[PDB]
Amino acid sequence: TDRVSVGNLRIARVLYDFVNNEALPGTDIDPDSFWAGVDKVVADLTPQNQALLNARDELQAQIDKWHRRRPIDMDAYRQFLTEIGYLLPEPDDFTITTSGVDAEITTTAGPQLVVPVLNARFALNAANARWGSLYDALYGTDVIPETDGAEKGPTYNKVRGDKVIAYARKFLDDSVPLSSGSFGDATGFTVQDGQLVVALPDKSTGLANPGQFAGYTGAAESPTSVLLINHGLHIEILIDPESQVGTTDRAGVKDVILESAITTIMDFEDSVAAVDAADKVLGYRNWLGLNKGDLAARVLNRDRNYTAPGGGQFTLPGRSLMFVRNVGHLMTNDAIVDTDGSEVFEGIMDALFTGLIAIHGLKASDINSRTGSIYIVKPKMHGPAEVAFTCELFSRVEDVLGLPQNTMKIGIMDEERRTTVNLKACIKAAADRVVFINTGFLDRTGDEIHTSMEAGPMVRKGTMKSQPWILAYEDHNVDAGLAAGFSGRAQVGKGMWTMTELMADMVETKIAQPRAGASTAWVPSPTAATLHALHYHQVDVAAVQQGLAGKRRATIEQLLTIPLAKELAWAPDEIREEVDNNCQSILGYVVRWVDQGVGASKVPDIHDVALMEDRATLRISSQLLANWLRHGVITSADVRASLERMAPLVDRQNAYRPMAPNFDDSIAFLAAQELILSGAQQPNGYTEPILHRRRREFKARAAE
Ligand SMILES: O=C(O)c1ccc2cc[nH]c2c1
Ligand SMILES: [Mg+2]
């Protein structure tokens, strides 16, 4: 074949070439020593990797049987979980020791943006989303109602623009209050004796807290902009009477700029579809362009220059601080196969290659962490041993890369049940590497359903968000983080807002996350990060965290409360709706995944709301239907009929290729069907083995 032999490994030429010609040059790592390291690391860690996955299966089988032989005793269930080593002892209190971590992670609370690394233009916008226009975010979304008069048109609408301006003035009043009066009545800004002075019609005033004045641009006498800081986040008022908006403005203001996406996660996992060496290389190459600072379509932003209150000069980061999300322990990829032809573990490969590439970001670029850290998000881990394994992998990789030990820092996803109930030990296992924990609530619900598949029928998918287990899971995660001393040291993060068009709703409800003590939470786009930034100005996360300290708000019993439905909880019509809804979302996502290699896309649901979502929402839907089928809530004819019914709608909702009417001939349709009908047999309900196989199948058919 077209592979390169190195030890026991056979590396796809496209990857070998990528590494030698693009990734390695500029790192000072000897190419031959690198490849020897890859061979050695894969050979050494592969057995432990496999045994961990086998252990998952064995635990699940025991729980499966336990439920089959079962009016539901929690004392018994809990002592059984401890017996089989599912529930492990909680360690004594400790504080994490992770050092050399940047301020964007240790200290600054704010939005965290996640983007598919395979999409270069998306990744570019994400990195540039550290600063974003509040006016654009308000004007373009439904935050400002399109009520009579204020509708978006083909051209600028002055009625709407004025509501945007008023909305921002109120934000300023709430965030950076004047000693007296309102920003709404401002006519000018000036800096005098190093102090911000605001002109109102009748008199002048300063800030109630002059500590919020951070800097300015242009002459102090008539600044071209004024820079404020609040709860550690910057706000920049652009002052330009010459501009169109500025002309209509009372103080010549052109825009309000928010520091928005403080950090960004470049994603190789659930938001992308990458099933072979060509796909991985595309991803790795974008990740390289990001770290080298030369990725272009439009290019990456430079730092920002300001004059300090006093009159000196300083600078602020122009770009979002980058994490990379590697895949988890489950999958293999044929990017590399061994002599026997066995595919190599993809997570192992990601650590080596994304780690290698990240070195560039530590270096002056013809730039990322100034403290010398590399930030890797690791998803879908089940328990402390799997966490320890990930740390051992990073340690071995650091050795191959000639990096100081603990350079490679870990963002722990809390998105599997065996991690949730052992969270303190999982953190302890990574106490010198961990830079965040985060509630991946969607995968977590998929795992919740699969783990208790045999217990009985589960509540409807929309009911899950408010079940006792998930509310406890959220509080427990924050409690464990704070108890491990995350305050001032590491992020406590919460989940993604998936309704991309419902920004009014996001601004209304997503404030609950910072109020819950989360120093960060996930947004889908630059625009959403700007709007989500508002919440951090309203909530004092540091204070909230201090108030939460030492609280223990979720019991193990609460964590373990299985979301079983009550006897006969559903009328026939509600059942049908749940089925159609789930089939619709499965089909809408899968069709783009299998046909176009698109791992994340705005997909209208049944009620026709635009949902982003990724692989995890597929995991939830397939497991729920698999659970209902397993326990006789629905029949196989129900599933099939629903799939055939929703298919044409999906086709219609959509370079596309219709699934209907020849379903048995549609690879996408059959993948969706397989996900449901084989759902119960997928390891932890994971959708990758099926998706990957079907996408490779589609690629092979397209080729001929
Ligand atoms: O981190 C994820 O699982 C996730 C979820 C939704 C979206 C939409 C774009 N990127 C995503 C990532
Ligand atoms: Mg997830």
From Swiss-Prot:
It holds the Pfam family MS_N. It is an enzyme of class 2 (transferase). Mg(2+) binds at E415, D443. Its cofactor is Mg(2+); Mn(2+). InterPro entries: Malate_synth_C_sf, Malate_synth_sf, Malate_synthase_TIM, Malate_synthG, MS_C, MS_N, MS_N_TIM-barrel_dom, MSG_insertion. SUPFAM superfamilies: Malate synthase G (SSF51645). Glyoxylate binds at R325, E415, G440, F441, L442, D443. The modification Cysteine sulfenic acid (-SOH) is found at A600. GO terms for cellular component: capsule; cell surface; cytoplasm; cytosol; extracellular region; peptidoglycan-based cell wall; plasma membrane. The active site is at R325, D614. Its main location: cytoplasm. Its EC number is 2.3.3.9. Acetyl-CoA binds at V114, R121, F122, A123, L124, N125, S271, R298, P524, G599, A600, S601, K602, D614. Signal peptide: none annotated. It catalyses: glyoxylate + acetyl-CoA + H2O = (S)-malate + CoA + H(+). Pathway: Carbohydrate metabolism; glyoxylate cycle; (S)-malate from isocitrate: step 2/2. By bromopyruvate, oxalate, and phosphoenolpyruvate. Malate inhibits the activity to 50% at 1 mM concentration. Glycolate inhibits only at fairly high concentrations. Keywords: Cytoplasm, Glyoxylate bypass, Magnesium, Metal-binding, Oxidation, Transferase, Tricarboxylic acid cycle. It is found in: Cytoplasm. One of its GO terms (molecular function) is host cell extracellular matrix binding. PANTHER family: MALATE SYNTHASE G. Belongs to the malate synthase family. GlcB subfamily. Homodimer. NCBIfam families: malate_syn_G, PRK02999.1. Involved in the glycolate utilization. Catalyzes the condensation and subsequent hydrolysis of acetyl-coenzyme A (acetyl-CoA) and glyoxylate to form malate and CoA. This is Malate synthase G. It comes from Mycobacterium tuberculosis (strain ATCC 25618 / H37Rv).
